[PDB]
Amino acid sequence: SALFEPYTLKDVTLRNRIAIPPMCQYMAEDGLINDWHQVHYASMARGGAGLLVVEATAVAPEGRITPGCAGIWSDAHAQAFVPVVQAIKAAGSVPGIQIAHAGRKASANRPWEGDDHIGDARGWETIAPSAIAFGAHLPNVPRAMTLDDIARVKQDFVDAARRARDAGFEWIELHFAHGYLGQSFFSEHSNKRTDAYGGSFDNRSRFLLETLAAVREVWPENLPLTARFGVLEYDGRDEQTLEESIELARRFKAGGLDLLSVSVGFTIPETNIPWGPAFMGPIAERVRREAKLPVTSAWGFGTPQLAEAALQANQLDLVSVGRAHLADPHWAYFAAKELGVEKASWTLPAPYAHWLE
Amino acid sequence: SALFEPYTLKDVTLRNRIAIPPMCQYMAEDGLINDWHQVHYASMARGGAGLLVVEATAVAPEGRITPGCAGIWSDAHAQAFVPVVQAIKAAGSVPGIQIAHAGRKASANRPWEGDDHIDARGWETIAPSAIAFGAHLPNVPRAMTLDDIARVKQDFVDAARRARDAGFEWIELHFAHGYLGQSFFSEHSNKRTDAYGGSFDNRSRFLLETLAAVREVWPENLPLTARFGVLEYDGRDEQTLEESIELARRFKAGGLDLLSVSVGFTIPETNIPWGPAFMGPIAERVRREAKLPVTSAWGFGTPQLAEAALQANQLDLVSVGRAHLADPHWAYFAAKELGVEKASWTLPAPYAHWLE
Numbered sequence A: 001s002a003l004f005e006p007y008t009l010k011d012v013t014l015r016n017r018i019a020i021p022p023m024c025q026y027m028a029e030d031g032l033i034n035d036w037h038q039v040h041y042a043s044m045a046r047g048g049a050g051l052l053v054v055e056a057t058a059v060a061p062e063g064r065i066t067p068g069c070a071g072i073w074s075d076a077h078a079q080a081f082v083p084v085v086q087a088i089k090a091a092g093s094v095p096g097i098q099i100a101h102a103g104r105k106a107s108a109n110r111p112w113e114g115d116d117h118i119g120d121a122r123g124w125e126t127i128a129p130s131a132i133a134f135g136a137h138l139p140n141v142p143r144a145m146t147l148d149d150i151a152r153v154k155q156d157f158v159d160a161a162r163r164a165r166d167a168g169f170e171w172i173e174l175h176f177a178h179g180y181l182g183q184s185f186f187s188e189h190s191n192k193r194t195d196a197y198g199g200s201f202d203n204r205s206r207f208l209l210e211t212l213a214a215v216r217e218v219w220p221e222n223l224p225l226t227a228r229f230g231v232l233e234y235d236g237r238d239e240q241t242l243e244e245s246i247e248l249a250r251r252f253k254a255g256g257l258d259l260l261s262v263s264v265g266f267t268i269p270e271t272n273i274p275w276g277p278a279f280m281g282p283i284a285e286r287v288r289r290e291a292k293l294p295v296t297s298a299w300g301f302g303t304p305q306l307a308e309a310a311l312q313a314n315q316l317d318l319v320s321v322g323r324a325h326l327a328d329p330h331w332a333y334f335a336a337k338e339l340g341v342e343k344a345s346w347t348l349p350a351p352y353a354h355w356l357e
Numbered sequence B: 001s002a003l004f005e006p007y008t009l010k011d012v013t014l015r016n017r018i019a020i021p022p023m024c025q026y027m028a029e030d031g032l033i034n035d036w037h038q039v040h041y042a043s044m045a046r047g048g049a050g051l052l053v054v055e056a057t058a059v060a061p062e063g064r065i066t067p068g069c070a071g072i073w074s075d076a077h078a079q080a081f082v083p084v085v086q087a088i089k090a091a092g093s094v095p096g097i098q099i100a101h102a103g104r105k106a107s108a109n110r111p112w113e114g115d116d117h118i119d120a121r122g123w124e125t126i127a128p129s130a131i132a133f134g135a136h137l138p139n140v141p142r143a144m145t146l147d148d149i150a151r152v153k154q155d156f157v158d159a160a161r162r163a164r165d166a167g168f169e170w171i172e173l174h175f176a177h178g179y180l181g182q183s184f185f186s187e188h189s190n191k192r193t194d195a196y197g198g199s200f201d202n203r204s205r206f207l208l209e210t211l212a213a214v215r216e217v218w219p220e221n222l223p224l225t226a227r228f229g230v231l232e233y234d235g236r237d238e239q240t241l242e243e244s245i246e247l248a249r250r251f252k253a254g255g256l257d258l259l260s261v262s263v264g265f266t267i268p269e270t271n272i273p274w275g276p277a278f279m280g281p282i283a284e285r286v287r288r289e290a291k292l293p294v295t296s297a298w299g300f301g302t303p304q305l306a307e308a309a310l311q312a313n314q315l316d317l318v319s320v321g322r323a324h325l326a327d328p329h330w331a332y333f334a335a336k337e338l339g340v341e342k343a344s345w346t347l348p349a350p351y352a353h354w355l356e
């Protein structure tokens, strides 16, 4: 079963091709994680997945999506992640983390408490390339960033990467997708700047390439440096947007990116996304083949046969399974059993495996 | 769905009828639990089960089944349970614990390391009589004196007291599966001629005296339960079952709040008819004749089987063990499988919102 093939990238070996993608828990307070996250991540790690990417972690307080989002903007925040790393490693899984800045989609309520912008002593001004609201349920207009804002946020990403390294993460992912800060710099929908960071393809790519280059300097060369990146919007410009996105991926690769998590942009709400099980499969394959970068992707791979089929077709190097690990922390064990893998129960630690054969 | 109906017993209310039975993890060190147990228990509790009974916890070092078994024979051992209790409560589940003495079946290797009598890690075992279990447990126990019986009863009391102070809201005496209490009740293993063997009253005495002693420190408003093997499948089933139900009646008169109905496993010469929910009709008969609430286990991981046993009034609580090892969130799976409305809110909000 290709799903249960190990995977080596730089000095890191994953015991199988199942990755748990980042999924915010909306349970931290002032960015500090707690007992919720500890049990949550240690449990999925024991489930058998080879890689576990911790949820989107803000590099700065205004970079949080919500007041419940994890943060790593101070050394105290970094230290709280230390026992999460040790517990993921102790389970045999690889700890990774996604560091993020929500840009103009920040200052929002938790999804089960409105899922929209905060009107309210809990709100904060947001920043983005240009002062243009997302629209829909995020109508707050962001402040357009100055050159000093750009230098500061890049340094936040560097500090977040450095803290992540020192906490023991072995895998880092820059959040350049889903309409957040990095994504909003790349898209013409959101970036109307006329300085060095807007207009041309080179200028729109600049924020992302510079942030990657700064992180490359503190992130160890022997540990995978990856990014999640929205390569099309389904906005009626997909062939053009896909071509630019793949070219940027080529510049990511020249800049030391080791793997790309292929996603959708979500930069604006006026879209027609063709949701379906594994619908990203063919987009990720094209990115993998044209930019010659390993990839992962997500959405609907919780059906084990779909995950297997995506790997055997070389559309993916890793399969990311999110909501299914929320439903079942031990989904990897379910998948090994579902795919007839030999000694499927030994995907779990011995206190479970011995009794489930 | 009756499986997702709350249940009240003394001052404790369970949010549904799903109980996680005690399941030893073989991951403790000299009886001390650690980060393995903390995440193991907090995760299953977040899965939605209403009651979570912590694994068999030794009241004394020689009462461990294996060297990886939890213990509660000191205050340091009890304090280690505090964060497990608190995490179970924080998830909305009820923490219980099974306190135990393995008797003549102790000093054994972990199931994945031989599963047989133990080597510098072994120890002398005690039992009513100096008679080995047999099979892969051939070490002969030391027969207990009256002073031994007084010691072990006080161990159960001290364990109950520690359990209370750690915050458990539900206690289970392990009088099943061939361990010390079970071996005192069975004629197969109890050949004593003093006040603790021979007649039915004498064979019951240790169990009734341990229960009464535990009752003195265990709060009256928190469920006091026991797990008890009511038959052996040893060719003496109607006689054994009738005696076992009689003892259950005396347990009830002695303050037992619920009975976890199991098989004795006192000797190896048996023909147990394993099958899905096979204990159902045994538990129903005990429930009806002893007029006590009951739970039972073995094969209720099929949600429809759990629902059927509750609707038939064979059980008050359904114990689901191995399915919660495979899937810590089994309660949510059972809710979805049985068409329960807002099934995803069996889980906490960070999960429930996304599974609607």
Ligand SMILES: Cc1cc2nc3c(=O)[nH]c(=O)nc-3n(C[C@H](O)[C@H](O)[C@H](O)COP(=O)(O)O)c2cc1C
Residues within 6 Å of the ligand: A021, A022, A023, A024, A025, A055, A056, A098, A175, A177, A178, A228, A298, A299, A300, A301, A302, A320, A321, A322, A323, A324, B350, B354
């Ligand atoms: C609760 C939840 C939180 C999410 N948080 C993040 C996040 O922190 N970062 C991210 O890039 N994607 C996030 N996602 C998207 C997932 O990583 C993934 O792309 C998506 O769930 C599709 O995979 P699935 O079908 O296996 O769930 C989130 C999804 C869910 C359900």
Ligand SMILES: Cc1cc2nc3c(=O)[nH]c(=O)nc-3n(C[C@H](O)[C@H](O)[C@H](O)COP(=O)(O)O)c2cc1C
Residues within 6 Å of the ligand: A351, A355, B021, B022, B023, B024, B025, B055, B056, B098, B174, B176, B177, B227, B297, B298, B299, B300, B301, B319, B320, B321, B322, B323
């Ligand atoms: C790993 C494991 C450990 C167990 N440990 C205990 C224990 O500590 N005490 C006990 O009385 N029963 C113990 N049992 C029995 C379970 O409580 C339960 O009755 C049995 O597994 C049947 O239920 P199930 O079919 O849902 O797993 C254990 C079973 C397993 C598989």
Ligand SMILES: C=C(C(=O)O)c1ccccc1
Residues within 6 Å of the ligand: A024, A056, A065, A177, A178
């Ligand atoms: C943080 C998220 C992201 O990266 O878009 C997210 C959060 C909830 C659902 C989907 C995605």
Ligand SMILES: C=C(C(=O)O)c1ccccc1
Residues within 6 Å of the ligand: B024, B056, B065, B111, B177
């Ligand atoms: C401690 C146990 C018991 O109560 O007999 C146990 C341990 C392993 C498997 C079944 C049961």
Ligand SMILES: [Cl-]
Residues within 6 Å of the ligand: A186, A187, A188, A189, A241, A244
């Ligand atoms: Cl564009």
Ligand SMILES: [Cl-]
Residues within 6 Å of the ligand: A288, A292, A293, A294
């Ligand atoms: Cl490649």
Ligand SMILES: [Cl-]
Residues within 6 Å of the ligand: A334, B326, B327
């Ligand atoms: Cl399963």
Ligand SMILES: [Cl-]
Residues within 6 Å of the ligand: B185, B186, B187, B188, B240, B243
């Ligand atoms: Cl008998």
Ligand SMILES: [Cl-]
Residues within 6 Å of the ligand: B287, B291, B292, B293
């Ligand atoms: Cl009754």
Ligand SMILES: [Cl-]
Residues within 6 Å of the ligand: A327, A328, B333
């Ligand atoms: Cl499920």
